[PDB]
Amino acid sequence: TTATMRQRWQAVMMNNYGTPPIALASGDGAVVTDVDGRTYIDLLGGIAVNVLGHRHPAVIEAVTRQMSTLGHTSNLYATEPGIALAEELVALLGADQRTRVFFCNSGAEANEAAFKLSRLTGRTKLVAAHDAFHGRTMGSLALTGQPAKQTPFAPLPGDVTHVGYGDVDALAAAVDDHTAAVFLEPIMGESGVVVPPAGYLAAARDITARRGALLVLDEVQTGMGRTGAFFAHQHDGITPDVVTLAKGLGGGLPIGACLAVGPAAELLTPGLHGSTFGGNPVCAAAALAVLRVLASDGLVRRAEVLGKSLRHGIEALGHPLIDHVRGRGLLLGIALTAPHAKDAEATARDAGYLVNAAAPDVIRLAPPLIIAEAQLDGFVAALPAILDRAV
Amino acid sequence: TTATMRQRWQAVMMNNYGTPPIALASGDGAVVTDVDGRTYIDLLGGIAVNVLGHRHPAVIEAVTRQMSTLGHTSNLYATEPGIALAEELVALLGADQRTRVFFCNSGAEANEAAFKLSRLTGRTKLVAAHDAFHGRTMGSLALTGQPAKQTPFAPLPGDVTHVGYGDVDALAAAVDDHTAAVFLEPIMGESGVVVPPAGYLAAARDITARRGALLVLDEVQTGMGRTGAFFAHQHDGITPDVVTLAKGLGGGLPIGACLAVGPAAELLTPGLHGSTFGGNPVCAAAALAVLRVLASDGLVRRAEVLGKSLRHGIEALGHPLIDHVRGRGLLLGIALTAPHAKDAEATARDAGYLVNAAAPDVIRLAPPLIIAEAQLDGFVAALPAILDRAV
C-alpha cells in the first residue's frame, strides 16, 4: 500500500525531498502504476530523464548485453562504449573545431567539470542567470541562481554574478576581461520553462567571444532532442565553448557529460580531473542505445511536431486560468493567471496525469519522446476540468 | 587492436586521465580480457569498485529484473529498491540513534552532501588530512588534501584546515568550537593505503564530540566489507555522525550514499538538497544484490581471512624491494624500499596482473571479494620476478 511505503520512507530517508505523495511499483512506456494499482500517464518523464519511457527494449538489450560482456573498469583502461558515445556526441554537436568529452554521473557533476574548466582560463569571475538551475553540489550550487537553495550553505565558491535571464544589456555589462565563463540554460527548466527572447543566445555568444569568456550551455534538461534539435542551442545557430548533458542522456541510467570545443577542449591535462564511474561501459551502452533509437525512430523531429500540436491544443482551449503556453518541442510550460500550479498538479494526479508545478504559476511538462499523440490529446481534453478543480 | 582503440580515445576524450595503456574488451569474475585477447587477473577491481567482480549473476539478475519492472522515477515518487537499500544500510551501520540516508551517484557527491550537512551546523570551519582523497568536485576537492590537484582551481569552498594523518595532537589543535566537521578516511586509499595508528579514529571521535564538531568518515573505498567489517570504522568501536559510501556500493553501477546519525540526520529539510538520479531503482537494486551476496556467501569474513593470508605470503617472500605490507582485509598496500611502484605496475601488467601504483613507492591492491585463493597465490609467486624486472 501507499501508506506503508510512505511510512517506510519517513523512517529511513533524509527529509531533503519531503515525503513523496505516491509510491510507484511499475512502468511501461509512458504509463506508470502505483503500489495501489492506479495507472498514470507520465507527462514529466522523471523530470525529463525518461526520454524513451520505461522498459524500452533497446535500452534493456544494451544494458543486459553490456553487463554480460564487461562492467565498470575505471578510466585507467580504455573501453569501447564510452569512446563510441563520445564520438557520437561530438558528431551530434557538429562543431567546426576539435571537441573533447569528459564523462561523469550527473548534471551537477557535468557543471562541476565545466566550473573547473573555467578556472583553467586564469579567471575566477563567473556569470549566470537569476533563477537558473545548474545543480546542488558546492560548485554547481554557486552557479545556480536560487538564493533559497544557496543561503544555508554559504559561503559558496566564487566569484559569481547573477543577471536577469534574457536581458542582453545586463549580460554585456556583467561580462568583462576578468570573466572566466558565462553559464546559461537555453530554456530555464526548473524555474518554469522560461524561454529567452529571440537573439539572446546569439548575443551571449558574441559578448563572451569578444571578452575572452567561455560560453557554457547547460543542456542537461533541454538536450537529448527534446526541443526538436538534439541540442536546443542549435535552433539559434551558435556553437558554445562548453556544453553539459545529463538527465535523459542515459535513458534513465546515471550518466552526464561535459563537451568542450576548440581551445577549451585542451584545458584539462592529465591528473587535473576525474570521476571513478565516469564513462563506464553499462551506462555508456545505455546512452548509445538512446542515441540509436532517437535517430532510427526520428524522435527529435517528432518532438517538434508533437510539441507544436500540444501547444496549439492547450491554447485552443481558451481556459481563463492559462495566461500562455511556452517552451519548445516536448519541454512545455503552462503559465497560469493565478498561483494554482501546485493545486493543478494534484488534480492532474487525480485525473491520472503526472505533471510538475515548477513555479507557483507554472505547470511543467517533459514527457517521454515516445509518448503517443493520443496520450497528449487526452491530457488536453482533460485539462479544462483539471484546471477548474484546481481553483 | 589496442593501437586503434587508444587512437580513438586520443581523438575524442579529454586528456584529464592521460591515455590508458590498455583497452579492455570483456570481464568475468576477477579476470578481464583486452582487445587483443590477453587476460589479466584483476587485483584492483577498477579501483575497489568491482566487489563481486564482472558478470556476477546476482547483480545481473537484479538489474535485468528491475529494468523490466520500473526504471528511473526521480524522488518525486517513492520506490521500493531505494527504501529497502536505505533500510539495509542503516541496519549494517548499527548506530544507537536514528540514522537517515541520502542517495547520490558518486563518492564526490556523497561527500558534497556531507559538506552541505556540515554547513547546517552553523559553522564553516572544516578539518581534513594531508594527502586525503575525498573527490574532485569543488566541495569535495576542498576536502581532498592534495595541493597539486587543488591549486589550479583555487579558490575552493572554505574554510578547510589540513593536518597530518594519524597525528592526535595536530588534530586536537586544529579542531575548535568553530569547527563544523572533521573528514577522515579510516585508511587513506588513494595516497597509498595509509593506516592510522591504533586509537586514532577513537581519538578523532572524542575530539570532535568534546568540541561540538561532526565526525565524517569517508568509507567510499574502505567500505563494502573490504576490510573484514562492513564499515572499516566498525573495527574501532566508534559511531561517527556521518558516513559516506560509493565505489563498490553498486557492484559496478553508479551509486553513492550519505548516512547521518542522530541530530545530523535531521539537518536536511525539504528542498535543501537533492540529486536527480539518486536512489533510482536500477542502481539500488544492484546495490541490494551486492549486500545479499556479501551476507549469503560470507564475503566479509573471507576478505579478512584472505587478506591475512595474502599479507603473510607477500611478506614471506623476503624480497629486498618490499619494506612492509599494510592495510586490512582486501585493501592492501605493498610499501617498497625504493620508488619503483610505477615500473612494477607495468611489469605486473606484463605478467598478467592489474595493480595500482598509488604512490611512487606503494603498490595498491583492492581485488574483488570473490577472487580465487589460487589467483592470489599465483600473484604472490609471480611478485619476485615482477619486482626484479621493475628494477
Numbering used by the authors:
A (entry chain B), B (entry chain A): 7 to 397
From the study:
The first crystal structure of the ArgD holoenzyme from *M. tuberculosis* obtained ([Fig fig3]) showed that the protomer has three domains: the smaller N-terminal segment (residues 7 to 74), the relatively larger C-terminal domain (residues 286 to 396), and the central PLP-binding domain (residues 85 to 273), which is also the largest and has a Rossmann-like overall fold ([Fig fig3]). The prosthetic group PLP is covalently linked to Lys253 via an aldimine linkage. (a) X-ray crystal structure of *M. tuberculosis* ArgD showing the dimer. ArgD contains the prosthetic group PLP that does not leave the active site of the enzyme. Therefore, all the PLP sites must remain occupied during screening experiments to represent the native state of the target. While ArgB and ArgC do not have a human orthologue, ArgD and ArgF do and the *M. tuberculosis* enzymes have identities of 36 and 41% with the human orthologues, respectively. For ArgD selectivity might be more difficult to achieve since many of the active site residues are conserved in comparison with the human cytoplasmic and mitochondrial enzymes.
The L-arginine biosynthesis pathway consists of eight enzymes that catalyse the conversion of L-glutamate to L-arginine, appears to be attractive target for anti-Tuberculosis (TB) drug discovery. The arginine biosynthesis pathway consists of eight different enzymes ([Fig fig1]) all considered to be essential for *M. tuberculosis* growth *in vitro*. In this work, the ligandability of four enzymes of the pathway ArgB, ArgC, ArgD and ArgF is explored using a fragment-based approach.
